Design a protein around this ligand. Structure first.
Ligand SMILES: Nc1ncnc2c1ncn2[C@@H]1O[C@H](COP(=O)(O)OP(=O)(O)OP(=O)(O)O)[C@@H](O)[C@H]1O
Ligand SMILES: Nc1ncnc2c1ncn2[C@@H]1O[C@H](COP(=O)(O)OP(=O)(O)O)[C@@H](O)[C@H]1O
Ligand SMILES: Nc1ncnc2c1ncn2[C@@H]1O[C@H](COP(=O)(O)OP(=O)(O)O)[C@@H](O)[C@H]1O
Ligand SMILES: Nc1ncnc2c1ncn2[C@@H]1O[C@H](COP(=O)(O)OP(=O)(O)O)[C@@H](O)[C@H]1O
Ligand SMILES: [Mg+2]
Lengths: 248, 239, 228, 212, 375, 188, 404
């Protein structure tokens, strides 16, 4: 039994606690970052579809902290909340000492260093939260990144985290698009990937939360989709699959 | 006594926990660096960035100062925090002390950092090792490596476990006491070590060469492929 | 009865630091001799790889020119003790404007050695040999993770230290000249460690009352090579 | 009706039991703890009950238990059941008739709960390590057959033989005899006894300042 | 008994010739002809008048008297007749008795002890040196300590050595450690006893060490024999389980040497974790030899497919050298899957003949079976 | 569920019906099978069914006896099942709920590596949950595929109803289709 | 890729044949016909006679076999009990035919009543169960092979460097039995218990075998693991007949090897554990020194952990003398090298002292292994003489390979 504490090493040289954390996000959600151009989006599904849950904040998976930053969340809710507030504080400090927007990579690496520090020291537990962010800055513009409890940040053209991640990444390899891959094509791909990852047919709009950032508004804007536009996207996917059935 | 604690000795005096740190490094990928006639050359391998993942975020190599760069193998989080610590240490020492920094001081500092974070309970040791290159041994090149046990040493050429078992034996068989003739033969020997490395396809292999008088230089994939083809041809007429 | 240093064993011993004594066994052997002509220290290398810089192993290190030092143990705690020794000697000079006598170095180093379980850690698995030529003439001391220190006419510490120590006891006496003591240490090392001795696999250091500088030996081992 | 003999080994409990058997002329039953365990389900209980029955049928009888802790282990249920049969035989409806029981152990702490009850074992007799004068008498007793030289101060040997048990002192006399044989001595003297103690006393241990 | 093996497995008329030659010999053997064209039996079989009973004997009082017990459990002091093999009768054996006076009338084929009946493994004929790829250093070393002492003690007899009593095989799993020792049994004539260290760890207090005695007893009556202790590390490493394992270990060291004699049986042990077992196993006085099994290199691997690809039908596009280059990534046992998965893979292609692409689609699936960590 | 039947047949029924194919193409016969899915949901129902169609001896082992947990007989009991199966060849060995100690796991791996396929004797070991141990068992010479048991679909659940619907009577219009759709994600 | 399914029965027929049509049908027919014809041969040959056989014909039968068959009594075994002796003329005897019954019987007129004691394991006739013959008491089977019954081929000459150890050991174990007259005339009782202790491989078992060879009296070997039995109390019972069997001999030696296996000190803080072993160890302690003096049964005891043994067993009287075994010095190493190399085929020109002083604290087993490895080095070159070079290379191999 060499899995008790985060600060010990096992005779095969692995960290069972951090692996347990990865498996903890293994059933967290199905949040994804879409491969897109002219605009970048996040797609999230909520396992809280219910007749009485209120969703008062109009969003429980997405959280926006900038005029050019936003994040999608899948993991332990308390850890997720403290991490998002910590990101807000880091952005505030960087804007105060630089009077300049933070680079996305510097911010995410700072968070990953904090997470690694939280894992390294004794009596402390890894944040079992993996969350996806997007941002536009003066270093690399359109940017999409992923972070994990161990303190590692993953840069991806497209990625998905949470449950059934294998199917999502496999199809994103298969249904991959490059370059000209507009935001609307990203909406179609996100719709398809969530329909396959979920067991549902005719994916209901209230079971998905999607936000995006657009740069034709080059002063920069971030939008969170409402129910009607998502339902229209669902109808478009349904007519696409109906046409595919007509292709026989 | 057993290995369940950081500060506990084994009944024969061994510290199994730091040995487990070294082994956790040993599972980490290939990392081999050499110092040539004047230049120091390194080669990053086994990145295997799969399609959707971007190679920019991999950070195959990070430069601490203009005369020292590092990448580490093992856990990327520990590698990153040690990179930040070394960068801050070297920059602050050069800025504050009456005289500037040399690679020996930062070597001592990182060795001390590993020894310190290894020294007490409630504080996990780093699971990373790295091969240090310095330019200002009175202008001469020099090469170290670092280990989770807080241990460092100087080498003419060094490798770590996954790359060690094959590549390092290949070097100790091949390494000429004559320093590799010019940076050309330095890169040739690095490419030969990469040939001793697992795959050598060039899909993820990248190299950074530092001349010990010039600052660090980064090699493009096309030049790496050209060098690999040149080495393959050289093996071809070697018959 | 092994959880920590701060627990007494049933016999009154400590089964936590007795293993720190066992850690000396896994370290390389080193030889130290005190002679009226001078103090000499010998260190075994067992070359690990030709690519290594041979001097990169700090098992032979100087804390001041009037004194010598040698190591047997984990090189990390070794370097910690080495740094602590240099710091105490330099501060002693800074305050008193004189050389720190070797006995005071050995005593003052040991206070850091006495921190495993009495402040508010773990004993350093390193055993050291000191050699100094000062106001009490030529001196050689030995100190171990338990914190005890002893003035030694000769001493061998590390792996295979027992046989070397026994043979040295059979040959050595406290009235030799320095050269024959070095020769005895060299033949004992040649017997024990690997093979025919050379600069690659053995290190030598010696300081003299008339030469309170440069214990180190750099390719003057060639005389030893042609002699022994 | 119950006498328990306890103390460190070498104090001579077995010897006292042997002498008590020697002088009593009564029916004497000797047995060790492992003789009663057995593997069969009831076998040990049958042995205990049947031994008590035999002690009854012989009328004035003494039972000697040696190393009672074998079945006297605290409250594997087989040994427990045999031990319970033992205490019920010891107490007994129409108790004990005329059967006296003697028990010898080196470790009382294993006996504990109810075997040490005042009813079953009325008298607990402690056997201490032999006193200095006691050790002198001890060496006198076993040297009686060995033809020692008269110029030997057994009080001096007692002074040397601290912490010695009776068995160790007997071994000291035997070692003096063997040392005399090694010398091929016609008679043995005080020096031989000193060498005997020096070889008996202890391991003498290692260098006790270099420890940790 | 068994037939010889045809030399080429490939479909050819040479194999037809060999099989028809064995057919011809078997036809000459085909009993019909001989089936077409007294005092010793009459007297003694009268003495052992039918029916006969089987009894267990554990005594020899005189050279003609002993105590014999029957199945119901009753014990009888009975006389031994002349025709009973005196050396064959030993305590614990099963003896035939006369039904009238229970007189001992002969020894019987011993058929009992099912556990050791499993323990005397087959001759291992399926394994052979011809099935092993390029373990040259291991072969000569294992030949030094195991095969040669059991084949020509003459060198040891003349020169005066006592041959080594034990060898331990260490290496990563699948390197062929077990296969080599099994091949030694086939190569020699000695009977093969195989045991995996995990099995001898037993629930009851004393059976674990008893099995160790039970094994080395079994080796002794077979005289030339091999005891194979697979994955020894379960009973040998470092330190109520604690005490019994130590007790079990010490039993090995007492049967691996210790007191009395050891006869002729050789002991071979295997494990993956030589750096973990008790120094008593590493003790270079207790165990004379420790054999290294590295991961197969380029040349060794090429032999492995040559050994394993010999049986399927191949294409000309197969490039075995390409599948070799990467590293010593996989052991031979993995390469068996490489062949097996490919054979299935080419089968899924609806082709009875394998191509290079099948091996590439064989190599990848083997690789995904590996774990993940330290990203 | 239909995909389960084909791959189990290809890995159990097929090695039973046509051994000539594997000798003709020179392969070692497939040796083990491992099932992923929710507990039951046709897990045992499949293994019991295939043995009937091959008429080989079926061995049923619960996960409970596998985990005796006081070093009961795990060391040798595995062999005793195996040897008896060889005595009654051809036979099928089935164990369920492997997730329900390490020493007998190594024992099973060695036997799985060691026993001969010369008797059409195969091991089908089944699991309910996704465990870290399970991914470690997928090794050469031990198991060859990853059959999955998904939760039954709408029409699929309807067929399950129809399986037991033969015995039950009905009204003048029982539409099982409408009943079927009321339990999304329900197991078998 | 494109999804596909398994094979079709229609496909398989041609697919198994298709390309392979050259010799496949013929080869398969030959193979199956070979198999069935072999089964034929095995059947027509008949069942291979599982007849065990008898002694070779020249020795056996004779009319004497039928004579003893028709004349001798099929005696039955039983256990005597509690001689009645009510009238002392025909004292009557109660016996227990074990598994069969219990009876009150008399003696045959051939056997005297003085020839029968209580229990006595007496055999009786089959008809009226008269006492017809006394029988030796049944020693437990597993206890029986524990008797060595053969002398190992080692003398005290083989043991080297332990000269004072073997001297005291011969003083304590061999001297009293060979020369009892020295002790009694002086008037001393010699010691009866010896404990041999030291590092592993020091040579304790070697001295044991040497004693067993030079004993000339009855010698019984014991390994501490043997007495451990899964039944409760079986080990103690085993120790009981082990000691009683020894008492039957005219003085006898008993040798326990690594008594550590059961000799552990008694402990209770586990509320269970190895107490079953502890009961056997208590029985052993009682047997060595207690009531019913042991008699002329000298006990030889060797173990790697003298510290761990229970003090009660460790007490003198049971273990009278403690003998300490240490790693050989240079003189001891030279002596043992002389011992082992003497039997080996070498040139009589080797510097054994050089080898020994080259040898570190390496045990005696290391010396034996190094000599054997030098022989192996010679064998690998097929040199029918060993060389000093072989001895050196063996020293490097063994000593440095472990010392790595
Ligand atoms: N007071 C004593 N007087 C004479 N002899 C003694 C005495 N005490 C011990 N001995 C000696 O002790 C030897 C055996 O020890 P004994 O068994 O009697 O002691 P113990 O402490 O009861 O031991 P254990 O409980 O192990 O049997 C005898 O041979 C006897 O000579
Ligand atoms: N060098 C080799 N030559 C031939 N076969 C090999 C070799 N290495 C591995 N194998 C294959 O691996 C199996 C032997 O595995 P092995 O390593 O003995 O198991 P373990 O690791 O349990 O000892 C054999 O079936 C054989 O086909
Ligand atoms: N797909 C299915 N169709 C019909 N019945 C099923 C199905 N899956 C499970 N069952 C029911 O499950 C029972 C068989 O046990 P099963 O669930 O297959 O495995 P386990 O015995 O492990 O639970 C049967 O009684 C059967 O009615
Ligand atoms: N003092 C010695 N003299 C001669 N041979 C020795 C000596 N010590 C060890 N040996 C050799 O080493 C072996 C030691 O075995 P031993 O130590 O008796 O086993 P155990 O572990 O049972 O005590 C012997 O076979 C012997 O050949
Ligand atoms: Mg007593």
């Amino acid at each position: 039994r060499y899995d008790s504490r985060t600060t010990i090493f096992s005779p095969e040289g692995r960290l069972y606690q951090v692996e347990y954390a990865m498996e903890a996000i293994g059933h967290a959600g199905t949040c994804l970052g879409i491969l897109a151009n002219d605009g970048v989006l996040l797609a999230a599904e909520r396992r809280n579809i219910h007749k009485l849950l209120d969703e008062v904040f109009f969003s429980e998976k997405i959280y926006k902290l900038n005029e050019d930053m936003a994040c999608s969340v899948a993991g332990i809710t308390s850890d997720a909340n403290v991490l998002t507030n910590e990101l807000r504080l880091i952005a505030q400090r960087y804007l105060l000492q630089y009077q300049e927007p933070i680079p996305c990579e510097q911010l995410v690496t700072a968070l990953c260093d904090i997470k690694q520090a939280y894992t390294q020291f004794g009596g402390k537990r890894p944040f079992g939260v993996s969350l996806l962010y997007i941002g536009w800055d003066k270093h690399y513009g359109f940017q999409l990144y992923q972070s994990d409890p161990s303190g590692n940040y993953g840069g991806w053209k497209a990625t998905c985290i949470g449950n059934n991640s294998a199917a999502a990444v496999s199809m994103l390899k298969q249904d991959y698009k490059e370059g000209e891959m507009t935001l609307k094509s990203a909406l179609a791909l996100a719709i398809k990937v969530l329909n396959k990852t979920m067991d549902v047919s005719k994916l209901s709009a209230e079971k998905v939360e999607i936000a995006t950032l657009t740069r034709e508004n080059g002063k920069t804007v971030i939008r969170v989709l409402k129910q009607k536009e998502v339902e229209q996207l669902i109808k478009k996917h349904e007519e696409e699959e109906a046409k595919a059935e007509r292709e026989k | 006594s057993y290995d369940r604690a950081i500060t506990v000795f084994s009944p024969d005096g061994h510290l199994f926990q730091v040995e487990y740190a070294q082994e956790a490094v040993k599972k980490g990928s290939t990392a081999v660096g050499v110092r040539g006639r004047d230049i120091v050359v390194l080669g990053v391998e086994k990145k295997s960035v799969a399609k959707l993942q971007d190679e920019r975020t991999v950070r195959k190599i990070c430069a601490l100062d203009d005369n020292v760069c590092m990448a580490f193998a093992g856990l990327t989080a520990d590698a990153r925090i040690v990179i930040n610590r070394a960068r801050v240490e070297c920059q602050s020492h050069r800025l504050t002390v009456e005289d500037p920094v040399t690679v020996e001081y930062i070597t001592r500092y990182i060795a001390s950092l590993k020894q310190r974070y290894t020294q007490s309970n409630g504080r996990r040791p780093f699971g990373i090792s790295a091969l240090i290159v310095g330019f200002d041994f009175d202008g001469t090149p020099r090469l170290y490596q670092t280990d989770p046990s807080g241990t460092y040493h100087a080498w003419k050429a060094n490798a770590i476990g996954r790359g060690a078992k094959s590549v390092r034996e290949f070097l100790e068989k091949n390494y000429t006491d004559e320093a590799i003739e010019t940076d050309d033969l330095t890169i040739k020997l690095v490419i030969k070590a990469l040939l001793e490395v697992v795959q050598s396809g060039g899909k993820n292999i990248e190299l950074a060469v530092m001349r010990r008088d010039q600052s660090l230089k980064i090699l493009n994939p096309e030049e790496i492929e050209k060098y690999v083809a040149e080495i393959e041809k050289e093996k071809e007429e070697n018959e | 009865y092994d959880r920590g240093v701060n627990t007494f064993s049933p016999e009154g011993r400590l089964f936590q630091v007795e293993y720190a004594i066992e850690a000396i066994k896994l370290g390389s052997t080193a030889i130290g001799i005190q002679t009226s002509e001078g103090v000499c220290l010998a260190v075994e290398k067992r070359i690990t790889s030709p690519l290594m810089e041979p001097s990169s192993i700090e098992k032979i290190v100087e804390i001041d020119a009037h004194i010598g030092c040698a190591m047997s143990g984990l090189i990390a705690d070794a370097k910690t003790l080495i740094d602590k020794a240099r710091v105490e000697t330099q501060n002693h000079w800074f305050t008193y404007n004189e050389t720190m006598t070797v006995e005071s170095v050995t005593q003052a180093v040991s206070n850091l050695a006495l921190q495993f379980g009495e402040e508010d850690s773990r004993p350093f698995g390193v055993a050291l040999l000191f050699g100094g030529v000062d106001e009490k003439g030529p001196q050689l001391f030995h100190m171990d993770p338990s914190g005890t220190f002893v003035q030694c006419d000769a001493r061998a510490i590390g792996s295979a230290s027992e046989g070397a120590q026994s043979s040295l006891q059979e040959v050595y006496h406290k009235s030799m000249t320095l050269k024959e003591a070095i020769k005895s240490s060299l033949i004992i090392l040649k017997q024990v460690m690997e093979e025919k001795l050379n600069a690659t696999n053995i290190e030598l250091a010696t300081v003299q009352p008339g030469q309170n500088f440069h214990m180190f030996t750099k390719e003057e081992l060639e005389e030893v090579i042609k002699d022994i | 009706k119950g006498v328990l003999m306890y103390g460190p080994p070498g104090t001579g409990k077995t010897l006292l039991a042997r002498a008590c058997a020697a002088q009593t002329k009564a029916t004497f039953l000797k047995l060790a703890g492992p003789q009663l365990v057995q593997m069969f389900i009831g076998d040990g209980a049958k042995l205990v009950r049947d031994a008590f029955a035999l002690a009854k049928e012989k009328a004035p009888s003494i039972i000697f238990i040696d190393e009672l802790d074998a079945i006297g282990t605290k409250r594997d249920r087989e040994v427990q059941r045999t031990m319970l049969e033992l205490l019920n035989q010891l107490d007994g409806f129409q108790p004990n008739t005329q059967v006296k029981v003697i028990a010898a152990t080196n470790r009382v702490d294993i006996l504990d709960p109810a075997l040490l009850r005042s009813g079953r074992l009325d008298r607990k007799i402690e056997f201490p390590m032999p006193n200095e004068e006691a050790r002198a008498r001890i060496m006198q007793i076993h040297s009686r057959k060995m033809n020692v030289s008269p110029d030997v101060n057994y009080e001096e040997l007692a002074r040397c033989t601290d912490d010695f048990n009776g068995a160790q002192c007997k071994a000291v006399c035997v070692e003096a005899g063997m040392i005399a044989l090694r010398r091929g001595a016609t008679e043995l003297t005080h020096e031989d006894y000193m060498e005997g103690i020096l070889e008996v006393q202890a391991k003498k241990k290692a260098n006790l300042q270099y420890y940790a | 008994s068994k037939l010889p093996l045809v030399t080429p497995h490939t479909q050819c008329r040479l194999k037809l010739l060999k099989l028809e030659r064995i057919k011809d010999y078997l036809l000459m053997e085909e009993i019909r002809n001989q089936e077409q064209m007294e005092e010793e039996r009459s007297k003694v079989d009268d003495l052992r008048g039918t029916p006969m009973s089987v009894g267990t004997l554990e005594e020899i009082i005189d050279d003609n008297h002993a105590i014999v017990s029957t199945s119901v459990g009753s014990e009888h002091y009975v006389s031994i007749l002349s025709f009973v093999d005196k050396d064959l009768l030993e305590p614990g054996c099963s003896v035939l008795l006369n039904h009238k006076v229970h007189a001992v009338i002969g020894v019987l084929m011993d058929d009992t002890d099912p556990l050791v009946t499993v323990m005397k493994v087959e001759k291992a004929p399926q394994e052979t040196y011809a099935d092993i790829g390029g373990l040259d250093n291991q072969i000569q070393e294992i030949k030094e300590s195991v095969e040669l002492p059991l084949t020509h003690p003459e060198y040891y007899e003349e020169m005066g050595i006592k041959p080594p009593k034990g060898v331990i095989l260490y290496g990563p799993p699948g390197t062929g450690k077990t296969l080599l020792a099994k091949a030694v049994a086939n190569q020699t004539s000695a009977t093969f006893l195989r045991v995996v260290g995990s099995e001898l760890i037993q629930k009851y207090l004393g059976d674990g060490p008893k099995l160790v005695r039970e094994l080395f007893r079994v080796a002794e009556e077979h005289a030339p024999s091999i005891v194979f202790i697979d994955e020894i590390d379960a009973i040998g490493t470092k330190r109520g389980g604690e005490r019994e394992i130590q007790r079990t270990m010490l039993e090995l060291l007492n049967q691996l040497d210790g007191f009395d004699s050891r006869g002729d049986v050789k002991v071979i042990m295997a494990t993956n974790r030589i750096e973990t077992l008790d120094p008593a196993l590493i003790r270079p006085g207790r165990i004379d030899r420790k054999i290294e099994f590295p991961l197969p290199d380029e040349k060794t691997k090429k032999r492995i497919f040559q050994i394993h690809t010999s049986r399927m039908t191949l294409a000309d596009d197969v490039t075995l050298d390409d599948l070799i280059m990467a590293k010593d990534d996989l052991s031979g046992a993995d390469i068996k899957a490489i062949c097996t998965e490919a054979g299935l893979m080419a089968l899924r292609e609806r082709r009875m003949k394998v191509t290079n692409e099948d091996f590439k689609k064989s190599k990848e699936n083997v690789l995904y079976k590996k774990q993940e960590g330290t990203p | 569920l239909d995909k389960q039947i084909k791959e189990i047949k290809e890995v159990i029924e097929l090695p039973v019906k046509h051994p000539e194919l594997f000798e003709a193409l020179g392969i070692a016969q497939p040796k083990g099978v491992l099932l992923y899915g929710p507990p039951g949901t046709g897990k045992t129902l499949l293994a019991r069914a295939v043995a009937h169609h091959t008429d080989c001896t079926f061995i049923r082992v619960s996960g409970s006896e596998l985990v005796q947990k006081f070093i009961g007989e795990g060391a040798r009991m595995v062999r005793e099942l195996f040897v008896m199966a060889r005595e009654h060849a051809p036979s099928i060995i089935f164990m369920d709920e492997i997730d329900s100690v390490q020493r007998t796991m190594l024992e099973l791996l060695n036997q799985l590596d060691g026993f001969e396929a010369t008797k059409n004797i195969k091991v089908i070991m089944a699991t309910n949950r996704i465990d870290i141990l399970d991914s470690a068992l997928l090794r050469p010479g031990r198991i060859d595929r990853k059959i999955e048991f998904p939760p039954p679909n709408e029409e699929a659940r309807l067929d399950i109803l129809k399986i037991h619907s033969r015995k039950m009577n009905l009204t003048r219009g029982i539409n099982l289709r409408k009943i079927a759709e009321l339990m999304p994600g329900a197991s078998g | 890729d494109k999804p596909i399914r398994a094979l079709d029965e229609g496909d398989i027929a041609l697919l198994k044949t298709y390309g392979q049509s050259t010799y496949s049908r013929q080869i398969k027919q030959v193979e199956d016909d070979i198999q069935q014809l072999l089964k034929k041969i095995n059947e027509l040959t008949g069942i291979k006679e599982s007849d065990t056989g008898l002694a070779p014909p020249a020795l056996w039968d004779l009319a004497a076999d039928k004579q003893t068959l028709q004349s001798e009594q099929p005696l039955q075994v039983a256990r005597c009990t509690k001689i009645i002796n009510a009238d002392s003329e025909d004292p009557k005897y109660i016996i227990n035919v074990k598994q069969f019954a219990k009876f009150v019987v008399d003696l045959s007129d051939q056997v005297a009543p003085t020839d029968i004691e209580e229990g006595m394991r007496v055999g009786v006739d089959r008809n009226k169960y008269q006492i017809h013959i006394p029988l030796p008491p049944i020693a437990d089977p597993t206890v029986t092979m524990m008797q060595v019954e053969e002398k190992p081929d080692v003398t005290y000459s083989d043991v080297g460097g332990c000269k004072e150890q073997i001297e005291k050991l011969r003083e304590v174990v061999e001297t009293p039995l060979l020369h009892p007259e020295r002790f009694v005339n002086l008037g001393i009782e010699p010691p009866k218990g010896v404990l041999l202790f030291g590092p592993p491989g020091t040579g304790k078992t070697l001295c044991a075998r040497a004693v067993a060879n030079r004993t000339d009296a009855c010698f019984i070997r014991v390994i501490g693991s043997e007495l451990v039995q899964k039944y409760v109390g079986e080990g103690a019972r085993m120790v009981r007949e082990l000691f009683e069997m020894a008492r039957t001999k005219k003085a006898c030696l008993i040798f326990f090897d690594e008594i550590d296996a059961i000799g552990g000190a008694r402990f209770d803080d586990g509320a269970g554990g190895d107490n079953e072993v502890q009961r056997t160890m208590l029985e052993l302690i009682n047997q060595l020194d207690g009531f019913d003096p042991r008699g002329n049964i000298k006990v030889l005891m060797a173990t790697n952990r003298p510290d761990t043994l229970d003090p009660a067993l460790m007490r003198p009287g049971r273990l009278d003398r403690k003998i300490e075994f240490s790693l050989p010095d240079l003189e001891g190493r030279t002596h043992i090298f002389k011992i082992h190399a003497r039997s080996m085929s070498v040139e009589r020109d080797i510097r054994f002292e050089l080898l020994a002083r080259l040898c570190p604290n390496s045990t005696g087993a290391e010396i034996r292994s190094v000599c054997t490895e030098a022989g192996m080095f010679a064998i690998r070159a097929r040199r029918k003489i060993a060389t000093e070079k072989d001895f050196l290379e063996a020293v490097n191999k063994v000593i440095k390979s472990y010392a790595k």
